[PDB]
RNA sequence: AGUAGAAACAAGGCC
RNA sequence: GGCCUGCU
């Protein structure tokens, strides 16, 4: 019914910025090594760990949900997954 | 015979004898309303809560000698445990339905004659003729109108003496009704209800309702007639008018 | 997309969809425990709004009383109870001048009523604080107990059967050295003068439940029986007065209120020319009852009753005299819990005077510390102001005087104002040639209100242009708009009985269609839902279903027995024939022609053991406490059927020391039934006289045996038997 | 003079006359000659009536003493000697039985032979004037009148004297005994003329004694007595006293109007704290349904058998294990309770006929889960005063909690359509009037719109659950009871179906007050993993109980299937109000019908059909990141129904307070938008009144967020 | 524990 | 263990 394609992951330095996107054809979750999958943002609603640092936006016209991540820290190192209401993307690595 | 006999039996016991002796007639009402039962604040909640019990209603003791204690499968119909502050016994709701399927039967032909107002309403509606519904803004203006369509041009007190003389001819006292309209009403309602055995109190209440004029303030648009106000809910609305002509006309 | 109903107001005006803003589909807030905290808070608040008054100690009750009347004028917008005697007397004088003959006439009718009123009128009231037992009891029970105590003490003027004589006895009781009361645990206890004075001047405090529209709970009060007659007379006078005032809206219903509001707004705006601007203030009064001093009501009534018989003035003045010295019982008490030892305790409120303050929190500790000086014999003196709207009508009179004081003849300025007042709520239409004029007019109205001990709630009030306003949950927007959310709680089974519930439900649907502009399809849906709930509540299902219940067997056999099953009542598991056209017809009469004669006779049988009728007042009257309003009574059309049973009573009296009340109830009811069989008109018209029961009963036995022989069943043998049995009961009453 | 009535007359007559004296309320000490005269009248009445009997013939039998027999009939039966009420009772009874005419005044006796009344009066004056006097007092009278007078003479009309003459000799001997006994006394200076018909009284209500002193302490500060204050009031006249105090009063006492503009209103502040948790008594958005496709109706059937049959329809059961703990309770108790429920369900399945209602064993597991024997024992204060821990019940403002995004999504999906019809309405009288046809068509349209709505499913769930819980509490007060959550719907194909969400175990429910709490434990199947929104399930314990396979194009999902288990509670009032959730349908559809009628008052025609089919007109019913979104009338119906359902589900005092204090501000904002120059006296006070209602309830916080969004979109 | 929210329930009393 | 009450 919906298929979800993520993009924009990778390797970034402490204090840096990174921009994820999800094309659907809605929110972002992350899972750190040995930890449970946590909500990052959904569209707005935001985890306390990322408030004032990460901003989620949604273009309904193009069914696309961008996540702008600023002021990145080593504790934000995770696999980041898009979700749409549940359908999940494949997951994109973010390494700070 | 009987009446004076339970009178003597009551006077036999000291407490009831004292109550009968020291209590004056005027205090009749007070002691009759003397009760420990508070008036319920939330009737719906407890009616929905009591009906889930066994033996939730109350009935006179005589029920114990007209209805069997149990039905075919053994569901109990009444209990012998009396109410809190009365000699009546608590009984189950089935004892009602049982009374409607095997209880004693009578001749209810005179109930239409007693409940004149309701049957007149039914007759008026049965022969009514409806019309097209017209959709247009209705200017509802608030007016004082008479709701009772059978009022005989009498007030509460004015017709109360008539009602007593019709039902309780001996307790009238000084009053002997002067107006001849009251004379004819007394004659008619006396010969009509000469042997009706429903109850003196209900007969008096319904005569009061029928003869006494009553008035209330309501938002009306058109109509204004007594027969046209009882169906005010069906003929007038917020944006629609339903032409109607009761059976009387 | 996120759904948001409130955004609907961006297209539909607020008043056209105001019903959405009334969450009357859920359980209303209830209080759980004691109301003592609220009572203490109210007492302290009433006493501190008048702190700048003068203190005195009553020589009779020995309680401290605070008189703020003629006190320093307020210098802030906070609530103040410093009413000025001269200002209020002048306001009443102007009210009389604008309505000549109002006071004299109203006093004349009140004098007629007072001198022809009876004692039994006091029984027609809800719970009252009986001082014989120090608890709330039904009005009739408390009246009977007080009469018994008075007769035992030697005050027997009430035997005249006149309420004025009962009040004479009540006042004479105030001058007695030692009265005697009865207590069960029977013990005879002696009350001295001061203790009886305080017991007669005290009020019982409870917590108001089922109050929708506020986060916090409030406290309400119930007076005794000694003071209710004076209150009745004073309220009769006030009602007779307000009925002559078109600016009042308290003694009328809702539709009359709407009509008067429309008339006043049209009068104010229409008469205003193009040059004059008009503004409506939707005002609520903060702490209305706490700032109304009974002494000022005494002043108003003594001005009203000028040039009248002195006895009338005295009897009408007794009430505010007692309210000025009124005491309030703190309440049920306080319950403590100890989790370490895992126990709970309940201390009565009367211990608050001496109990240490280690158990109470900071707020309650401070409240008790502040209220202790006013504690006298377990009750707190509450002289400064009224507790809970006992003098509603006099307060409305004062508000109407304020409203009329701006008729442009007393303003002496271009601006002027009018409006409608109903205690604690008002709508004020003020016109003036310019915004400065409107501001000056509203300022002067507020200032004059503060001179009469009346405060305007600035937080719950707002002013706009005329054409849109609110009044007691009635929203006017170029014409009143229906709400239908205030009457939603009344769409279920009332809880009286089967026939009564059916008739009440259909009649409520009809009325809300007539008044609250309920739609046809909505009314049909309401009928369907009400029928469903009615069948599911009384276990009376259609009969053709297989829903097993405790009553599904007898219903099913009655169904299979009946031939014309369309005539069966819904109470007996029959089809529902109701519709928009049939909402004004009782169920029995609507199905009369369809019933089988056997079932019809079994149903409407006078000899049924279920139907019980007590008095003409309780035949077809049901007391339904409406949501957001005072308790109200409704006439419901119903036919006396076997379904008109009355439900079971509480039955918890059996575990209390007050267990003998049930035996007295049974004996009184037996005697009353015997009298009714002797005097059939006992119920319809309450008998009057000064003789005793047995005299009337035996003498009527004599005469009825006589005449019923002169034609009837009796025989000489039986007639003589009755005559000598009457003689026997005569000699028995001798000894 | 009273010494005469002390001496001669018998007690019976003197107390009869004393009660007649009390009758009309005049005192005996002022004028006693009336007492003597009327007591002599009463005496002649007796002596004339008694000693006179009749048998089956006429021709009265006269016996000096009534012998023991049934033959004790009295010739003349007395009228007077009774109260006015009874005298008129006898008058009316005689008239109605004898068919005679009713006199307007009081007679004295009745007789059979001549079947009529006797009005005996013996006056001081001679008979031949008093007779016709009382005759012209009585109008057109057939009652025969007979009077004596002291000289000894008798008279009567018709020359009629109704009984023996020796009795009349008796009467006049009695008469002259009276006369020449006063001769020894000497009373005729007034006896002939002592009564003139005085009737006057003044009502006296005198304040005296203690009650007077109280009146002296209920005056303004500078008054000393009620007399002086009343004199001052009577002498008071208006002389411009309000103006003087208005001028002297400080000018800081004002009601200045603060203009209300677009930039004036500020957004309502929401409380901050831990996220808001779930409060509902059952799962709303995460419910799962096990079905059988039976033909039974809503109430038709037996609960336990239907539940077991529905549960047997699912395969894939696994041994339950903890997934998300309660975080405050003992999850192993919940696990053991679930396994116990399964075991006892099988136990019922084995036996002969499924019981209509089952009772469960009271194991320690459900003893803890249902809170049994935890209420502190009630004791007396005199026995527990030295306990330091003894204090009041915790009475403080509830914990503060911030809004979470789950309630918004729950409401969003509570307004969505479904693949079933969750309302099966009852029957109504066949429509006879055209207006009834219009109403029926409108009602059918709304039922088609709202029946396939999650709000209706929630309504039915709540109604059924609360009804069953209340009935079980009232019936099985002591013993824990099992109740399967059942709801019956109808598919698109038309086949009826049952659905089993889970089970409820009701505990001890000895509910006396309307606020007393009955505790139960609720278990509900679901597929929503609780590891994604843990803060919404603070009070739940969630286990893993199986796996479900729903047909999907992605092979087949084989999702996990969890059990949400929690301890909840209700009260009689809450149960009663939750069993009347069907009035949410009313509220909503009344609002929609009011909209339709208001619009149709403009165009003189019913506008329902085009509203529901064309769907051209739309109302703002939500906001998307792109902007405000409008939906058809049906979506408005569903949205209002969901709002009412959530009002009934999350009801609380916070909701009422916020609703009132926000309706005030909504009216002010509407006045602003209508260009009506709104003004306020203290807007900060209103804001503080609104903000104090928002504490921890998810529903009220969501309403406040909606109000802030409406303000942001409005004021433009 | 839970319900609930300015104080309560989580049975009461009587033997 | 036995019995009483569920707005008093």
XYZ file of N, CA and C in Angstrom, chain B residues 1 3-4 6-8 10-11 15 17 19-38 41-44 47-48 52-53 56-60 62-63 71 73 82-85 88 90 93-104 106 108 111-112 115 118-119 121-122 125-126 142 160 163-164 168 171 197-198 202 205 209 217 219 231 233 238 240, chain C residues 30 118 120 123 127 138 140-141 151 159 161 206 255-256 259 493-495 510 513-515 517 533 538 550-551 553-554 557 561 572 580-581 584-585 589 592-593 599 602 604-607 609-610 612-613 615-616 619-620 635 637 640 642-643 645-646 648-649 651 662 664-665 667-669 672 674 677-678 680-681 684-686 689 691-693 697 700-701 704 721-722 725-726 729 732 735:
558
model
N -68.662 -2.390 59.255
C -68.271 -3.390 60.289
C -66.761 -3.427 60.473
N -64.259 -1.586 59.399
C -63.497 -0.363 59.642
C -63.391 -0.057 61.130
N -64.531 -0.019 61.818
C -64.503 0.234 63.250
C -63.787 -0.898 63.968
N -60.940 -2.648 62.924
C -59.509 -2.365 63.021
C -59.275 -1.089 63.818
N -60.258 -0.183 63.854
C -60.143 0.957 64.761
C -60.003 0.495 66.207
N -60.878 -0.413 66.639
C -60.810 -0.931 68.001
C -59.520 -1.708 68.228
N -56.642 -1.163 66.779
C -55.599 -0.158 66.934
C -55.635 0.449 68.328
N -56.823 0.856 68.780
C -56.941 1.436 70.111
C -56.618 0.436 71.211
N -49.658 2.327 72.216
C -48.980 3.352 71.425
C -49.914 3.947 70.375
N -53.113 3.854 70.457
C -54.169 4.554 71.182
C -53.741 5.976 71.519
N -51.434 7.734 69.953
C -51.338 8.478 68.700
C -52.715 8.955 68.266
N -53.725 8.092 68.392
C -55.077 8.465 67.997
C -55.670 9.512 68.926
N -55.331 9.461 70.214
C -55.953 10.361 71.177
C -55.339 11.753 71.123
N -54.013 11.847 71.228
C -53.381 13.156 71.359
C -53.293 13.898 70.031
N -53.261 13.182 68.911
C -53.107 13.818 67.608
C -54.434 14.429 67.172
N -54.408 15.707 66.812
C -55.593 16.402 66.337
C -55.727 16.263 64.824
N -56.927 16.574 64.328
C -57.222 16.383 62.910
C -56.314 17.246 62.046
N -56.020 18.467 62.494
C -55.222 19.372 61.675
C -53.849 18.776 61.386
N -53.233 18.142 62.381
C -51.915 17.542 62.197
C -51.954 16.312 61.291
N -53.150 15.875 60.868
C -53.271 14.741 59.953
C -52.187 14.737 58.885
N -52.066 15.828 58.131
C -51.126 15.848 57.017
C -49.710 15.606 57.512
N -49.314 16.315 58.570
C -47.929 16.252 59.031
C -47.527 14.805 59.286
N -48.221 14.143 60.213
C -47.868 12.770 60.550
C -48.000 11.848 59.347
N -48.875 12.176 58.391
C -48.994 11.328 57.210
C -47.755 11.439 56.333
N -47.150 12.622 56.282
C -45.900 12.820 55.565
C -44.682 12.533 56.430
N -44.878 12.242 57.714
C -43.771 11.891 58.594
C -43.101 10.622 58.093
N -41.878 10.745 57.581
C -41.163 9.596 57.052
C -39.666 9.827 57.182
N -38.926 8.726 57.289
C -37.472 8.772 57.276
C -36.896 8.697 55.870
N -37.730 8.444 54.865
C -37.244 8.297 53.509
C -36.926 9.642 52.887
N -35.654 9.878 52.576
C -35.273 11.093 51.872
C -35.725 11.025 50.419
N -32.074 12.148 45.121
C -31.423 13.210 44.363
C -31.139 12.781 42.927
N -30.798 11.508 42.719
C -30.468 10.968 41.401
C -31.341 9.744 41.154
N -32.599 9.933 40.743
C -33.484 8.769 40.577
C -33.023 7.804 39.500
N -32.481 8.310 38.392
C -32.111 7.436 37.283
C -31.021 6.457 37.696
N -32.585 3.754 39.925
C -33.494 2.901 39.169
C -32.725 1.945 38.273
N -31.613 2.401 37.697
C -30.762 1.506 36.924
C -29.972 0.561 37.817
N -31.427 -4.218 38.975
C -30.533 -5.362 38.900
C -30.619 -6.255 40.131
N -31.406 -5.872 41.132
C -31.616 -6.679 42.323
C -32.833 -7.576 42.140
N -37.057 -5.778 43.536
C -36.762 -4.343 43.557
C -37.969 -3.436 43.729
N -39.197 -3.937 43.573
C -40.368 -3.070 43.668
C -41.130 -3.419 44.937
N -42.187 -2.668 45.240
C -42.976 -2.889 46.443
C -44.445 -3.038 46.073
N -45.156 -3.861 46.844
C -46.566 -4.105 46.594
C -47.264 -4.390 47.914
N -48.583 -4.215 47.913
C -49.366 -4.437 49.117
C -49.264 -5.894 49.559
N -51.525 -7.914 50.073
C -52.518 -8.779 49.446
C -51.916 -9.586 48.303
N -50.804 -9.116 47.733
C -50.166 -9.840 46.637
C -49.792 -11.248 47.069
N -43.001 -18.925 40.047
C -43.580 -19.233 38.749
C -43.207 -20.660 38.352
N -40.853 -22.205 36.547
C -39.492 -22.702 36.742
C -38.978 -22.483 38.153
N -41.145 -7.259 54.650
C -41.826 -5.993 54.438
C -40.828 -4.880 54.133
N -41.353 -3.782 53.596
C -40.535 -2.617 53.299
C -40.015 -2.001 54.599
N -39.201 -0.956 54.460
C -38.582 -0.316 55.615
C -39.630 0.247 56.568
N -40.399 1.231 56.109
C -41.353 1.909 56.966
C -42.790 1.730 56.527
N -46.072 -2.937 53.383
C -45.966 -3.524 52.057
C -44.734 -4.417 51.963
N -41.712 -6.346 49.558
C -40.901 -6.181 48.362
C -41.098 -7.373 47.436
N -40.069 -7.745 39.670
C -40.847 -7.178 38.558
C -41.644 -8.217 37.793
N -41.256 -9.493 37.855
C -42.029 -10.525 37.176
C -43.454 -10.579 37.704
N -43.639 -10.330 39.002
C -44.981 -10.314 39.568
C -45.874 -9.310 38.858
N -45.290 -8.284 38.243
C -46.064 -7.388 37.391
C -46.500 -8.113 36.126
N -45.534 -8.631 35.365
C -45.864 -9.286 34.104
C -46.766 -10.489 34.335
N -46.514 -11.246 35.403
C -47.407 -12.346 35.745
C -48.839 -11.849 35.883
N -49.030 -10.745 36.608
C -50.368 -10.199 36.785
C -51.014 -9.842 35.455
N -50.216 -9.588 34.421
C -50.740 -9.218 33.116
C -50.988 -10.414 32.208
N -50.676 -11.632 32.654
C -50.902 -12.823 31.847
C -51.789 -13.863 32.515
N -51.836 -13.905 33.847
C -52.760 -14.790 34.544
C -53.443 -14.141 35.736
N -53.233 -12.852 35.981
C -53.865 -12.182 37.090
C -55.349 -11.994 36.855
N -56.073 -11.573 37.890
C -57.515 -11.359 37.735
C -57.812 -10.310 36.676
N -60.860 -7.731 34.790
C -62.025 -6.921 35.116
C -62.557 -6.312 33.824
N -62.607 -3.017 31.900
C -61.967 -1.713 31.769
C -62.714 -0.789 30.815
N -62.599 3.050 31.934
C -61.376 3.849 31.899
C -61.414 4.917 30.815
N -61.879 4.637 29.596
C -62.057 5.727 28.625
C -62.926 6.854 29.152
N -60.422 8.677 32.055
C -59.310 9.400 31.441
C -59.806 10.084 30.167
N -56.964 12.155 27.840
C -56.059 11.389 26.989
C -56.798 10.740 25.824
N -57.968 10.156 26.086
C -58.722 9.537 25.005
C -59.234 10.578 24.019
N -57.560 13.292 23.290
C -56.368 13.553 22.489
C -56.206 12.498 21.403
N -56.362 11.227 21.777
C -56.199 10.141 20.812
C -57.231 10.261 19.699
N -56.368 13.150 17.332
C -55.257 12.867 16.430
C -55.609 11.812 15.390
N -56.427 10.821 15.751
C -56.705 9.725 14.829
C -57.399 10.223 13.569
N -42.839 34.500 21.567
C -43.247 33.868 22.807
C -44.525 34.506 23.342
N -62.520 22.863 42.369
C -62.231 21.907 43.433
C -63.498 21.546 44.203
N -65.441 19.194 42.102
C -64.852 17.860 42.127
C -65.224 17.137 43.412
N -65.150 17.826 44.552
C -65.533 17.178 45.803
C -66.992 16.748 45.760
N -66.775 13.328 46.487
C -66.990 13.275 47.928
C -68.161 14.176 48.303
N -68.312 15.549 52.231
C -67.283 16.398 52.815
C -67.267 17.799 52.212
N -65.048 2.367 39.899
C -64.332 1.894 41.080
C -62.821 1.939 40.878
N -62.330 2.945 40.157
C -60.895 3.050 39.915
C -60.223 3.507 41.200
N -57.763 9.313 42.139
C -57.442 9.472 40.724
C -58.596 10.111 39.964
N -58.363 13.728 40.692
C -57.219 14.336 40.018
C -57.512 14.565 38.542
N -57.798 17.982 36.363
C -57.041 18.239 35.143
C -57.961 18.641 33.996
N -46.415 29.690 29.151
C -45.790 30.595 28.206
C -44.922 29.768 27.261
N -43.092 29.472 22.997
C -42.792 30.109 21.709
C -43.674 29.541 20.609
N -50.307 19.945 19.682
C -49.483 19.415 18.606
C -48.482 20.459 18.118
N -45.495 20.761 18.750
C -44.231 20.127 18.402
C -44.242 19.554 16.993
N -38.146 24.887 13.371
C -37.199 25.983 13.198
C -37.266 26.568 11.792
N -39.470 24.827 9.202
C -40.487 24.075 8.484
C -41.819 24.221 9.197
N -18.399 15.167 41.257
C -19.007 14.913 42.554
C -17.983 15.110 43.660
N -51.402 28.334 56.716
C -51.511 27.214 57.640
C -50.127 26.650 57.936
N -49.281 23.431 57.722
C -48.921 22.345 56.816
C -48.114 22.830 55.622
N -44.575 21.672 55.402
C -44.221 20.311 55.019
C -43.817 20.229 53.552
N -35.149 18.744 52.282
C -34.427 18.508 53.528
C -34.294 19.785 54.349
N -36.338 15.091 56.383
C -37.402 15.664 55.552
C -38.192 16.713 56.322
N -41.291 17.464 56.688
C -42.410 17.009 57.507
C -41.925 16.374 58.802
N -40.885 15.541 58.725
C -40.376 14.878 59.920
C -39.844 15.892 60.926
N -44.905 20.880 72.274
C -46.051 20.450 73.067
C -45.611 19.815 74.377
N -51.414 24.397 68.110
C -52.627 23.605 67.961
C -53.736 24.394 67.283
N -53.437 25.568 64.525
C -53.323 25.220 63.123
C -52.917 26.365 62.227
N -23.447 21.366 53.777
C -23.155 20.187 52.976
C -22.410 20.624 51.723
N -38.458 30.696 29.257
C -38.986 31.362 28.070
C -39.398 32.796 28.381
N -39.986 33.020 29.558
C -40.301 34.382 29.972
C -39.031 35.208 30.108
N -38.015 36.196 26.645
C -38.904 37.222 26.113
C -38.576 38.587 26.704
N -33.880 7.447 31.134
C -34.963 7.007 32.005
C -34.901 7.816 33.293
N -36.007 8.481 33.629
C -36.013 9.362 34.794
C -35.717 8.586 36.069
N -36.368 7.439 36.245
C -36.138 6.610 37.410
C -37.283 6.636 38.400
N -40.812 15.870 23.480
C -41.767 16.822 22.920
C -41.420 18.253 23.318
N -38.420 19.595 21.708
C -38.763 19.940 20.336
C -39.477 21.281 20.252
N -40.341 21.588 21.219
C -41.093 22.839 21.180
C -40.200 24.020 21.539
N -39.417 23.890 22.609
C -38.661 25.018 23.146
C -37.240 25.077 22.588
N -35.787 23.785 20.115
C -35.600 23.665 18.672
C -34.914 22.350 18.301
N -32.737 2.137 25.665
C -32.275 2.203 27.046
C -33.369 1.793 28.021
N -35.306 -1.864 32.217
C -36.401 -2.563 32.875
C -36.516 -4.019 32.446
N -33.755 -11.867 33.458
C -34.536 -12.324 34.600
C -36.034 -12.183 34.377
N -36.452 -11.495 33.311
C -37.860 -11.238 33.041
C -38.263 -11.660 31.633
N -38.866 -14.670 30.452
C -39.715 -15.849 30.337
C -41.191 -15.467 30.416
N -41.570 -14.764 31.485
C -42.950 -14.319 31.630
C -43.348 -13.426 30.466
N -44.057 -15.679 27.454
C -45.342 -16.369 27.522
C -46.501 -15.402 27.331
N -49.170 -15.726 24.366
C -50.571 -15.820 24.757
C -51.421 -14.785 24.032
N -44.229 -4.471 28.774
C -44.558 -5.890 28.752
C -43.977 -6.596 27.532
N -43.118 11.150 16.003
C -43.179 12.590 16.239
C -44.616 13.045 16.436
N -45.571 12.371 15.795
C -46.972 12.742 15.933
C -47.603 12.215 17.217
N -47.304 13.223 22.406
C -48.147 13.861 23.407
C -49.283 12.957 23.873
N -49.174 11.653 23.644
C -50.213 10.692 23.987
C -49.611 9.673 24.944
N -53.113 4.786 26.273
C -54.187 5.241 25.402
C -53.849 5.095 23.927
N -54.649 1.437 23.280
C -55.874 0.952 23.909
C -56.692 0.094 22.951
N -56.869 0.557 21.714
C -57.716 -0.156 20.766
C -57.072 -1.426 20.231
N -55.925 -8.977 28.418
C -54.719 -8.270 28.835
C -55.045 -6.853 29.281
N -56.479 -7.160 32.804
C -55.439 -7.511 33.764
C -54.518 -6.328 34.034
N -55.049 -2.810 33.604
C -55.677 -1.678 34.284
C -56.754 -2.182 35.242
N -56.301 -2.877 36.283
C -57.191 -3.420 37.300
C -57.046 -2.611 38.582
N -58.104 -1.956 39.075
C -57.945 -1.162 40.307
C -57.440 -1.972 41.487
N -57.839 -3.234 41.594
C -57.429 -4.084 42.708
C -55.977 -4.522 42.626
N -52.180 -4.949 43.393
C -51.453 -4.633 44.627
C -50.235 -3.742 44.436
N -49.985 -3.251 43.223
C -48.799 -2.456 42.929
C -49.057 -0.958 42.981
N -50.053 2.543 44.165
C -50.249 3.193 45.452
C -50.259 4.699 45.247
N -51.334 5.347 45.691
C -51.486 6.792 45.594
C -51.629 7.364 46.995
N -51.285 11.224 47.900
C -51.929 12.527 47.973
C -52.135 13.075 46.568
N -52.982 14.104 46.479
C -53.239 14.752 45.198
C -51.966 15.370 44.640
N -49.609 12.620 42.616
C -50.288 11.705 41.703
C -49.460 11.510 40.437
N -49.235 12.589 39.694
C -48.490 12.536 38.440
C -47.490 13.685 38.384
N -45.317 17.858 35.559
C -46.543 17.103 35.344
C -46.335 16.178 34.151
N -48.157 13.031 31.896
C -49.413 12.354 31.606
C -49.196 10.847 31.629
N -52.957 5.140 35.282
C -52.633 4.282 36.418
C -52.776 2.829 35.994
N -50.789 -1.332 36.212
C -50.037 -2.189 37.116
C -48.548 -1.874 37.101
N -48.077 -1.104 36.124
C -46.678 -0.715 36.029
C -46.355 0.546 36.820
N -46.023 0.960 39.914
C -45.484 0.652 41.228
C -44.499 1.727 41.675
N -44.240 1.754 42.977
C -43.224 2.634 43.552
C -42.047 1.767 43.984
N -38.413 0.276 45.802
C -38.015 -0.040 47.165
C -37.365 1.167 47.835
N -37.486 1.225 49.160
C -36.881 2.291 49.940
C -35.475 1.888 50.383
N -33.851 1.213 53.345
C -33.797 0.050 54.234
C -32.546 0.018 55.105
N -38.996 3.872 62.171
C -39.759 3.036 61.248
C -41.041 2.524 61.893
N -42.711 4.085 64.259
C -43.587 5.251 64.278
C -44.169 5.512 62.897
N -43.355 5.358 61.852
C -43.857 5.500 60.490
C -44.994 4.525 60.228
N -46.977 2.931 62.353
C -48.173 3.217 63.139
C -48.898 4.452 62.616
N -48.151 5.504 62.274
C -48.770 6.697 61.713
C -49.472 6.379 60.402
N -48.855 5.551 59.558
C -49.479 5.204 58.287
C -50.726 4.357 58.495
N -53.366 6.777 59.575
C -53.769 7.615 58.452
C -54.645 6.845 57.474
N -56.576 4.296 58.252
C -57.869 4.150 58.911
C -58.684 5.431 58.796
N -60.014 5.798 55.246
C -61.187 4.948 55.074
C -62.389 5.519 55.810
N -62.154 6.234 56.911
C -63.238 6.925 57.598
C -63.567 8.254 56.928
N -62.881 9.775 53.374
C -62.295 9.561 52.040
C -61.607 10.783 51.460
N -62.025 11.993 51.827
C -61.432 13.206 51.278
C -60.139 13.600 51.978
N -57.330 14.264 49.096
C -57.536 15.340 48.131
C -57.536 16.703 48.814
N -58.358 16.866 49.847
C -58.363 18.060 50.689
C -57.943 17.657 52.095
N -56.842 18.224 52.560
C -56.334 17.922 53.887
C -57.359 18.344 54.937
N -59.497 21.255 61.471
C -60.281 21.208 62.689
C -59.374 21.212 63.901
N -60.512 18.964 66.692
C -60.828 17.741 67.409
C -59.725 16.704 67.199
N -59.835 15.596 67.923
C -58.887 14.494 67.831
C -59.429 13.384 66.937
N -58.537 12.455 66.579
C -58.882 11.413 65.620
C -60.112 10.634 66.058
N -63.665 9.702 64.107
C -63.852 8.362 63.560
C -65.046 7.658 64.199
N -68.427 9.446 63.162
C -68.792 9.105 61.797
C -69.186 7.640 61.679
N -68.600 6.758 62.491
C -69.071 5.376 62.517
C -70.532 5.318 62.939
N -72.666 6.816 59.951
C -72.647 6.055 58.711
C -73.358 4.721 58.885
N -74.633 -3.509 66.971
C -73.283 -3.969 67.263
C -72.278 -2.835 67.093
N -72.398 -2.077 65.999
C -71.526 -0.926 65.782
C -71.735 0.137 66.847
N -70.093 -1.078 69.962
C -68.646 -1.107 69.772
C -68.076 0.306 69.845
N -68.811 1.283 69.312
C -68.418 2.677 69.467
C -68.385 3.060 70.938
N -65.180 1.512 72.437
C -63.959 2.273 72.174
C -63.993 3.597 72.922
N -62.888 2.767 76.307
C -61.466 2.442 76.232
C -60.622 3.708 76.203
N -60.170 5.162 79.471
C -59.093 4.527 80.224
C -58.140 3.786 79.296
